[PDB]
């Protein structure tokens, strides 16, 4: 009856997501309603900036994507997935999209500003998280994945760079560029090398189980300070993953080791998350015994780390990036391609 009201919560969440998935919101703001302040991050096609919505005074993070660049790299269908999925989802550990729109040159997504910075930044500075600290984050991701997969979504880019820490020390997952709504199997060779499941590297065609592999990679990385498979070139990394020989630090508890040996399981019939009991194999695992799943969902557990936040619109938890004046062309580019945006 514990896993009975999860069933019911999730059935209602599916209903909410489908309404929004089938009829997506478009054109709910305009660029000139926002003052741009600072670049909080970059990618191939654009950037994410701190902005201030001027009618409310609220701060947001606004992703900006250059339409021509997206097309040149053959990413039209993925950027349409990103926005379509993001406008439709609603979970406490998924960044909330407030507005989206486009102009002649760009696509824009305005999300909740998450001022704590990327887990990445903190993970590299401290060196490594203790197990209770990594457990706290890891459980949020367990629930997010339970949420996403029940909606038939695969996330596919789990890593510290994509987990933003909010004002209460909880996670907000960002960057849904590789997220996809699929029943059955898919084949795109995408993701971050260190995090790729073995089946992706091998062109098997794969499913939501690659997200559980990636969870294993993250937990290790949070608890060790480095990932289980690294080398200077991607090809060397794939070789390490496909072999699947993991060594653990002498400090990892035996519970943690056993959890990871099950998550980083090359054999899909043995891998946790992918079996008859799905996600409960992970939740009832010994390493998670101190974890109160409902209290996590409700944000009632005290975080072990709350970031310094000196005012709204402060960016000292993020790195500095080179800025660049947006230019909006006088002619529409790639109109037909992004009509649904």
């Amino acid at each position: 009856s514990e896993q009975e009201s999860v069933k019911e919560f999730l059935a209602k969440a599916k209903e909410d997501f489908l309404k929004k998935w089938e009829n997506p919101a478009q054109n709910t703001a305009h660029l000139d309603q926002f003052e741009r302040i600072k670049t909080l991050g970059t990618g191939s096609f654009g950037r994410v900036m701190l902005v201030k919505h001027m009618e409310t005074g609220n701060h947001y993070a606004m992703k900006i994507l250059d339409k021509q660049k997206v097309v040149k790299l053959k990413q039209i269908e993925h950027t349409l997935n990103e926005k379509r999925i993001l406008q439709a989802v609603n979970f406490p550990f998924l960044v909330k999209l407030e507005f989206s729109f486009k102009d002649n040159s760009n696509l824009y997504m305005v999300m909740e500003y998450v001022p704590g910075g990327e887990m990445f930044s903190h993970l590299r500075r401290i060196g490594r998280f203790s197990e209770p600290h990594a457990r706290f984050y890891a459980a949020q991701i367990v629930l997010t994945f339970e949420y996403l997969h029940s909606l038939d979504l695969i996330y596919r880019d789990l890593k510290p760079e994509n987990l933003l820490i909010d004002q209460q020390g909880y996670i907000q997952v960002t960057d849904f560029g590789f997220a996809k709504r699929v029943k059955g199997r898919t084949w795109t060779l995408c993701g971050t090398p260190e995090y790729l499941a073995p089946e992706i590297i091998l062109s098997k065609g794969y499913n939501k189980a690659v997200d559980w592999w990636a969870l294993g990679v993250l937990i290790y990385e949070m608890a060790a300070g480095y990932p289980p498979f690294f080398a200077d070139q991607p090809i060397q990394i794939y070789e390490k993953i496909v072999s699947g020989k993991v060594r653990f630090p002498s400090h990892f508890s035996s519970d943690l080791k056993d959890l990871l040996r099950n998550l980083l399981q090359v054999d899909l019939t043995k891998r946790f998350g992918n079996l008859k009991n799905g996600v409960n194999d992970i939740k009832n695992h010994k390493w998670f015994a101190t974890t109160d799943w409902i209290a996590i969902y409700q944000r009632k557990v005290e975080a072990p780390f709350i970031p310094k936040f000196k005012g709204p619109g402060d960016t000292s938890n993020f790195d500095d990036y080179e800025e660049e004046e947006i230019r909006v062309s006088i002619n529409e580019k790639c109109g037909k391609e992004f009509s649904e945006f």
Binding site: F178, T192, F230
Partner: peptide, 20 residues
Amino acid sequence: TTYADFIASGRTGRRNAIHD
């Protein structure tokens, strides 16, 4: 140590995703 090797690797910065 493995940590020292990680820190001397070129993979401690932000990691970009791949595409075919």
